[PDB]
Amino acid sequence: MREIVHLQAGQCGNQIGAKFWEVISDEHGIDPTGTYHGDSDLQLERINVYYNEATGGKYVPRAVLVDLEPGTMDSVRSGPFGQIFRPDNFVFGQSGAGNNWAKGHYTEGAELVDSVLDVVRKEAESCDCLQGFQLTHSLGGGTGSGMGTLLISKIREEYPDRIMNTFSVVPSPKVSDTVVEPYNATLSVHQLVENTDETYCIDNEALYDICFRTLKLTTPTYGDLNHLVSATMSGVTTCLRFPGQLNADLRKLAVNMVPFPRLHFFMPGFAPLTSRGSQQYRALTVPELTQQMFDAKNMMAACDPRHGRYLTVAAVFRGRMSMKEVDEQMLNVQNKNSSYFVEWIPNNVKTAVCDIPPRGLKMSATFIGNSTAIQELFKRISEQFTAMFRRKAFLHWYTGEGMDEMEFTEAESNMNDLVSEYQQYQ
Amino acid sequence: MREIVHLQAGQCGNQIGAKFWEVISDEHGIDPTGTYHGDSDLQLERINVYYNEATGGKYVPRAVLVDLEPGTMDSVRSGPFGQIFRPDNFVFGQSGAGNNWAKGHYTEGAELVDSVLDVVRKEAESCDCLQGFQLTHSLGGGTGSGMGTLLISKIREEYPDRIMNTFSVVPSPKVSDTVVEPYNATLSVHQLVENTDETYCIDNEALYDICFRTLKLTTPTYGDLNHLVSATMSGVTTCLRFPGQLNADLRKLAVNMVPFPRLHFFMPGFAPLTSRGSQQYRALTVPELTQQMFDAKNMMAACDPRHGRYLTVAAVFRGRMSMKEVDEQMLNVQNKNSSYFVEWIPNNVKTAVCDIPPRGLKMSATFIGNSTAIQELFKRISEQFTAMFRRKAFLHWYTGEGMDEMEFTEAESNMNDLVSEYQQYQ
Amino acid sequence: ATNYSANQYEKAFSSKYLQNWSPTKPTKESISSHEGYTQIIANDRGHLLPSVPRSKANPWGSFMGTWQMPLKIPPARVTLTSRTTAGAASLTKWIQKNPDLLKASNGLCPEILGKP
Amino acid sequence: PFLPGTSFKDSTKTAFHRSQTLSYRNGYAIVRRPTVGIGGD
Amino acid sequence: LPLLPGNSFNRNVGKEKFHKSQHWGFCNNVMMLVSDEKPGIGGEPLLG
Amino acid sequence: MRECISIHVGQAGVQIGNACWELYCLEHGIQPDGQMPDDSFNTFFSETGAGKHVPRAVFVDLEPTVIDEVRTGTYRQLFHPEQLITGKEDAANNYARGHYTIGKEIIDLVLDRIRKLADQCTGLQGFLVFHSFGGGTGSGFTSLLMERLSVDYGKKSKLEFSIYPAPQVSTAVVEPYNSILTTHTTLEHSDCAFMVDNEAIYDICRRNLDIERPTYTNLNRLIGQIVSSITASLRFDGALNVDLTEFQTNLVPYPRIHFPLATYAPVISAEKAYHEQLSVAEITNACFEPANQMVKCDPRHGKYMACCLLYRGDVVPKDVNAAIATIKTKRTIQFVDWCPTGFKVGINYQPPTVVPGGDLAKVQRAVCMLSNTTAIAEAWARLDHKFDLMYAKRAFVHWYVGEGMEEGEFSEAREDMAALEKDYEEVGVDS
């Protein structure tokens, strides 16, 4: 009954949003035409969270699609689930950013934010009790990171007492897609720390590790990569849509999960991921879920928690599930791992259980983790940022849009202050 | 019992009046022959408002058509519904105007009003209790705005205690169909200030923009533009012909808007305009219908209400529905936009309901609004009238027709005071 | 002469939205409010009165043809970000050297941004 | 079911032409109904 | 299509001969319809 | 609606465009009559409602003997009649003739036609200009073309494809004079400028495609495949798109650094295509190989300072990342210290198409690399050497002075890129 308004920005944000709306529609039994074709009654008890009513029992998603290049727009519309989105929700300009945060934030994205804020207000004021907003974008590009942070800074001023989740694809450690990526990522993280309630870091190299070692696939296309993260997003908010024995929505998690307002950078992970051959040799049981959940291989970011300390841990279980084994297993890992957990907070683990499992699966779980080990992601792109900035390179494409050179110095000084307060809370 | 005498003027008035009489003939069930072929008795309850009685059960409209050239009257008669009008109601002339306001008001217009007043008086004396008059014309020409204000002046003296509504097409900021259109507009507005009960401002920018942004028509014809106006001007007076829960006469819609006699310029709008291919997605409820009324993109005048303050608002509804679901929405828009509604008066939204909806539709509404954004239209005309009158441009088409230059200084000095008086109430 | 914004449909009537990729004539965002009537400043034929100030520009226009443009046309994208204090000075001097091209009706208008 | 490993389909395709269902006409952004899919299908 | 705003189409998609009859004119200095037997636009009769 | 205007100036630009537009018609299924037997063609062709398609390109030249083959050849009906601009007398291997005397009477008509194609476009990505440095029209009239296009259009992308003068073999004597004086105009009025030279493509066709004697017909096909590989992300659906604005930003770090190198891989005959597999790793090391460069310069002396990879066909992103991780660990390949992430990738689905009579084979996957190096500094030390060696005794200068330019431009054009040569080492020295 507490609605969530979905926001997509950029090419990556629309390719991750198309698969996200495919897995939710399959979960609630919504066919690509728009009607409902299911077998249970609990699917329609809480469906207004993501869907709006229409004439004749048709359901439309509560999502907006923003991109400076309408090239990804046509691929989404021509897909298997492209006729379910509202045709007025597509917002698009004429010229792309071209992997430039300056163009996406100040020059090209400035005349499109007013046109898209009308549609955001139209979807938000039609909700009786709006829970909050949700944004899918990547820091890899110019319109996902450029006007994605512009939309964040206008939403926070208009709706201050709300919640807002960001699923940001932070740059890869080994091979990066963009040469000017340290400029786009440093200037966007600085915009994220004062204007976001919860942030999740998703790494493509971590997604490559899952599909190669844990899942044992040979052709991991981007559809298979986007299916893993869409399962995480549905599993985070499963207590809102489906009844359970211990319920926990987004505000319930973030209170237990964020000790200080500068500590909102999490790391997700999906528990029941098995290979084809390994399926015949494994029984799904509660210790098996909590053993694969805490594994550093399974986690969806390029930071090893063995090098750091677990600050706070969240777990959201699904399916008809016991309670003693749930409490026993996440106590045993805390007692065994005496050094990986901080000592000035007792019982770092927060528990939530949902009753309805995903289709074809008996049990499932989702992991949210706050660690000091995520600061090595920030240090890696900060040293690359300072390596490019000393020689004054690649930034005549930045100061030629009006931006001064003092913005980079304050963006790094905020970022070195951000890594320095992760260290003394370790 | 209460009858409305319709008046047309000019090329624009004749092509907007032929479409209006076609729409309300279909609303009341009148064939192009002139007889009655309908479905329900309640279409004969109040049919004398717009029709007369003839021998053999024929219904003729109570309208008069004036022009200086029979070229538009040739096209009206040859049209689809041109055979219903009385052949004696056509009052034409021998010589054209030329978008010369001086020609239509002084030289040729003096010899035609004594023939027009012979016809409108015959249509007015037959009514037992006449309600009011209507006038549809354009301010960009020499016939609708030149001769049409003589009918404004002369009818007012003969029938002082009557309500006079004008549907005036104000000049456009970017179309500019006439070079001398600020000369005709300034002199016509100066007459409409003290000699007109209600004024409805219609702009061709807003008529084009509504039909593209909302209705999504690739090729709009002027017949389609007239249909939007005809649906609006038939929904304003819908309570006189159909019985409802809370009726509203034209006098009812005059009392609850204008607080002072010099402030009667309005901004129309029509609610249920839905897209051609998006009626599958939309949900037809009065909260969705209300937010389409108050949207600034649905206005029929090229002036943003956000730049000014809402003085008073009328909202006449149509269709069978509930009353608290209407009154709650009027309360909600007032208590959320405290900066757009004027502070020295509360309760500035008047609401009304009619029972019978338009044909093929469930619910409908018509927005009328007194705003301070009308001063933006007048000050845009004033700066174009000043810039052309400084350099004595096109004055030999006016001074040679028998008027002094002091009248040009009078009209702007009346209108500059009107702009300044609108500003002090904001 | 002067364009005027529709103030809600202005996005629909911009240059690149109407498929015109060259730089634009400006748009009057705000409107000044006058008061009273206006004094008349010209003759019946269109001559200006002896007492009104007159601009000293060309009464026919400032269009510059093919054979009248400078031989070394300065560029339209000028950023002095990573250049030396002598090279950037040379570029801005080359920009300043021809005032005729900057104020013309065609008018290549460079935007000098940054510091060396 | 709907799992990452299980979800795969054979790609029996040759042409990957991209349609233009979102465009601009006059001064407005038009949303054409998709009358054809990817590759003229 | 019950005459809703936007639910109408032109009748001149491929028509030619867009003439117009002079229905209205002067005869002996009084205003009359000079002839009832005049065609509509291109020569077609006017609805009976 | 992502449309690009092609400019083909000079004999080289026209003859490149004959093979390039032959490739485009087969790629979208267009007969030479201009009609059909999807709207992916909309970026190059304009739909006339009768069913005809008209390219959005102009063919401009100063002599009639190169375009009158087009007006009578097998594509005489596809092209618009008024898009083939023809002069009367050529520049005759001169810069001053093509700049001050002969380039100015046609610059009215060329900018008239470009304005009409720009009005037709609903979204414009940039202009593609094809010319050769050693010619007369490509030297002179293109300098006016970029200078006037900056006046009319402010910040629109100007991608350029140039036939760079080969080091040891060339077909002109005053060719270094023509090529010094085009840099000075194109430093500030050009956005990006890929270079190829005819000598390096001669070595590629001799060793790889087992053909001994190529002509200009089967070198223009190789150039057409490179232009098709760049634009294929705009045309066809891909898993990761790249626009024209992207690698403009990604290859130019400084205002004087806009000279990237274009290479293509694999390029093999049909007999060897049976016998070699073509994996993603095997095609990503061929473009890095100095023997497969399409510019006659060894990048081992220099260092890679930006890169761009464009992939076509059956390609998997996982094997792309494994290939790039492999090429980063080679000590022969050297990058600058201020560019740690020096790569940019793009993926398209549709494999390259084959034309009848072509020398290439039907291959499922291919790559096109745009690499910016420091090793051009030796390619300008040589070209400044041979310009100097004939400027010392002031040879052929009475031909340039007598057409409308003074002697001071020669000292200006030499001094400007001499300072640029000190600029390349200044960027190249690590911290």
Ligand SMILES: Nc1nc2c(ncn2[C@@H]2O[C@H](COP(=O)(O)OP(=O)(O)OP(=O)(O)O)[C@@H](O)[C@H]2O)c(=O)[nH]1
């Ligand atoms: N790669 C390639 N280069 C060509 C081709 N045709 C001509 N060229 C180049 O063009 C140069 C000679 O200049 P042209 O283009 O023929 O002549 P121009 O540019 O029109 O100038 P003018 O000689 O004055 O007419 C040679 O050095 C060649 O490298 C071609 O088909 N392919």
Ligand SMILES: Nc1nc2c(ncn2[C@@H]2O[C@H](COP(=O)(O)OP(=O)(O)O)[C@@H](O)[C@H]2O)c(=O)[nH]1
């Ligand atoms: N996980 C995932 N990542 C993607 C997908 N598509 C693109 N990306 C990533 O997004 C980055 C480039 O983003 P980009 O398209 O330039 O963003 P934009 O320009 O703002 O639209 C690359 O590093 C890709 O790895 C996808 O479908 N899934």
Ligand SMILES: Nc1nc2c(ncn2[C@@H]2O[C@H](COP(=O)(O)OP(=O)(O)O)[C@@H](O)[C@H]2O)c(=O)[nH]1
């Ligand atoms: N909305 C609308 N405006 C019209 C129509 N016909 C004409 N106009 C407007 O009327 C103006 C010209 O009016 P004109 O013919 O000179 O009026 P007249 O001289 O009084 O007959 C133009 O600016 C048009 O925009 C119509 O059918 N609908």
Ligand SMILES: [Mg+2]
């Ligand atoms: Mg030539």
